[PDB]
Amino acid sequence: KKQILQAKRIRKNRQEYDALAKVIQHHPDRHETLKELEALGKELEHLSHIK
Amino acid sequence: LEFKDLVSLEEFYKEAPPDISKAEVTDPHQQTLARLDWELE
Amino acid sequence: VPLAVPLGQTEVFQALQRLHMTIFSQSVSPCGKFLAAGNNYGQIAIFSLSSALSSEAKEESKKPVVTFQAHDGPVYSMVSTDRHLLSAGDGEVKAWLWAEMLKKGCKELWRRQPPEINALLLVPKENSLILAGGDCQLHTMDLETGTFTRVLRGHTDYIHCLALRERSPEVLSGGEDGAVRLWDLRTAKEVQTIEVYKHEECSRPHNGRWIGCLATDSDWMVCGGGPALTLWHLRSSTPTTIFPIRAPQKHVTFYQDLILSAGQGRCVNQWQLSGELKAQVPGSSPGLLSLSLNQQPAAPECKVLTAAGNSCRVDVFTNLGYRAFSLSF
């Protein structure tokens, strides 16, 4: 009884984790966004110097 | 008993605002939830 | 099938009142042993729940041991304390003693008046009581002395339900205007507003914009009513998952790891937190308005789920797959 109560609590925790992770997976990645932000920042600095 | 990325811990603990840092969690459950919604924001 | 034929003006009138009865509110005693049911006509029935769940049980044990006229208008809300039963009726809250409501006296303790009162929230950590209704305002009352301290003004239309989650905002309130509002009790201000109809994932403009039910897991929220049965993440205000059901849901709560729901349909809806319909258990009423988990210490035998709505009877679930019996009003 005690182990199955703990098991259902851990199952609820896993379902909360999956519920947040599915919403996060509707958004694009993190590191690729950092790479394209670095590229856009370099291009914006070059365009600002040209302007 | 059948069920279905990450941030560095010190960077997460020192970059997030204390509303999202949740200093009362310093449980692993609320800690992982704070990591998840910090990644979302 | 027509077992009892009334044959008499008084008994035909009683059969007509039972046929047109709606049970709005439910409350449980400080022990598990008693149930209290509020009425369309302003009446209150008291159900010996331990006597109904006993091995020795008669057909007349599924009847009110004490029923009494308590309000002029309908009883829209009950709540219970360590000793009292607070009941919001016409426009005012009466208080009743659990020790004396079983006896022949049935007197009231007080009568405090701050339109209807749809939701009663009993706040721990301080003796207080939050009134909400057709005044579109949240009133806070001390339980010891009948003085009203805070008045909160954020909604446009009237309020259906209140909530509590024991953090810094700590008070949710949902209303007919279509927005869940957060009410910090210290500053007595509104700190966050979640408009559920504005999000296109939830909208459903056919039923309209009204929030009938709220629930808290201290980090999460379940919001339902007009738009959709939605799972919101608090501190983010993002719609995480939607529960795919057509009928509007009048009540929702958190189980151990399930979501219980009831509305204009006949059955009690058991959802998983991912968003999968786990079960639908049919009840005896055409529609339900109230669920109650009787999770009280010192009476483990009175651990049932009670459901009530557009009927004169209360469905009692001793298990979550079938109804055991039903208590007539």
Curated annotation (Swiss-Prot), chain A:
Q: Residues of the signal sequence?
A: none
Localization (cell) = Cytoplasm; Nucleus; Nucleus speckle
Task: Tell me the superkingdom of the source.
Answer: Eukaryota
Please list the disulfide bridges: none
Task: Describe the task this protein carries out.
Answer: Component of the THO subcomplex of the TREX complex which is thought to couple mRNA transcription, processing and nuclear export, and which specifically associates with spliced mRNA and not with unspliced pre-mRNA. Required for efficient export of polyadenylated RNA. Plays a key structural role in the oligomerization of the THO-DDX39B complex.
The family assignment reads:
Belongs to the THOC7 family.
**Oligomeric form and interacting partners:** Tetramer; as part of a THO-DDX39B complex. Component of the THO subcomplex, which is composed of THOC1, THOC2, THOC3, THOC5, THOC6 and THOC7. Component of the transcription/export (TREX) complex at least composed of ALYREF/THOC4, DDX39B, SARNP/CIP29, CHTOP and the THO subcomplex; in the complex interacts with THOC1, THOC2 and THOC5; forms a coiled-coil dimer with THOC5; together with THOC5 and THOC6, plays a key structural role in the oligomerization of the THO-DDX39B complex. TREX seems to have a dynamic structure involving ATP-dependent remodeling. Interacts with NIF3L1.
Q: What is this protein called?
A: THO complex subunit 7
Q: Which organism is it from?
A: Homo sapiens (Human)
> Source gene?
THOC7
From Swiss-Prot, chain B:
What gene does the UniProt entry assign to this protein? THOC5
What is the scientific name of the source organism? Homo sapiens (Human)
Q: What is the annotated quaternary arrangement, including any partners?
A: Component of the THO subcomplex, which is composed of THOC1, THOC2, THOC3, THOC5, THOC6 and THOC7. The THO subcomplex interacts with DDX39B to form the THO-DDX39B complex which multimerizes into a 28-subunit tetrameric assembly. Component of the transcription/export (TREX) complex at least composed of ALYREF/THOC4, DDX39B, SARNP/CIP29, CHTOP and the THO subcomplex; in the complex interacts with THOC1, THOC2, THOC5, THOC6 and THOC7; forms a coiled-coil dimer with THOC7; together with THOC6 and THOC7, plays a key structural role in oligomerization of the THO-DDX39B complex.
Role summary: Component of the THO subcomplex of the TREX complex which is thought to couple mRNA transcription, processing and nuclear export, and which specifically associates with spliced mRNA and not with unspliced pre-mRNA. Plays a key structural role in the oligomerization of the THO-DDX39B complex. Regulates the expression of myeloid transcription factors CEBPA, CEBPB and GAB2 by enhancing the levels of phosphatidylinositol 3,4,5-trisphosphate. May be involved in the differentiation of granulocytes and adipocytes. Essential for hematopoietic primitive cell survival and plays an integral role in monocytic development.
Q: Which domain of life is it from?
A: Eukaryota
Task: Write out the tissue specificity statement of the associated record.
Answer: Ubiquitously expressed.
* Sequence similarity: Belongs to the THOC5 family.
Name of the molecule in the record: THO complex subunit 5
Subcellular location(s): the record lists:
Nucleus; Cytoplasm
PTM statement from Swiss-Prot or TrEMBL: Phosphorylated on tyrosine upon binding to activated CSF1R; which causes a dissociation of the two proteins.
UniProtKB/Swiss-Prot annotation, chain C:
A single GO molecular-function term is: RNA binding
Please provide one cellular component term from the Gene Ontology annotations of this protein: nuclear speck
Q: Which GO terms describe its biological process?
A: apoptotic process; central nervous system development; mRNA export from nucleus; mRNA processing; RNA splicing
Q: Which UniProt keywords apply?
A: Apoptosis, Developmental protein, Disease variant, Intellectual disability, mRNA processing, mRNA splicing, mRNA transport, Nucleus, Phosphoprotein, Repeat, RNA-binding, Transport, WD repeat
Q: Name where it mostly resides.
A: nucleus
Write down a Pfam family by its short name: WD40
User: WD repeat ranges?
Assistant: 18-57, 70-108, 115-153, 154-193, 203-242, 244-281, 283-327
So which domain of life are we looking at?
Answer: Eukaryota
- Residue ranges that the Swiss-Prot or TrEMBL entry lists as coiled coil: none
Q: Name where it's found.
A: Nucleus; Nucleus speckle
- InterPro entries referenced in this protein's UniProt entry, alphabetically: THOC6, WD40/YVTN_repeat-like_dom_sf, WD40_repeat_CS, WD40_repeat_dom_sf, WD40_rpt
Residue(s) carrying Phosphoserine: S168
Task: Provide the function of this protein.
Answer: Component of the THO subcomplex of the TREX complex which is thought to couple mRNA transcription, processing and nuclear export, and which specifically associates with spliced mRNA and not with unspliced pre-mRNA. Plays a key structural role in the oligomerization of the THO-DDX39B complex.
Q: Which disease is it linked to?
A: Beaulieu-Boycott-Innes syndrome: An autosomal recessive neurodevelopmental disorder characterized by delayed development, moderate intellectual disability, and dysmorphic facial features. Other developmental anomalies, such as cardiac and renal defects, may also occur.
* Family statement: Belongs to the WD repeat THOC6 family.
Database matches in PANTHER family = THO COMPLEX SUBUNIT 6 HOMOLOG (PTHR44411:SF1)
Q: What is this protein called?
A: THO complex subunit 6
- Originating organism: Homo sapiens (Human)
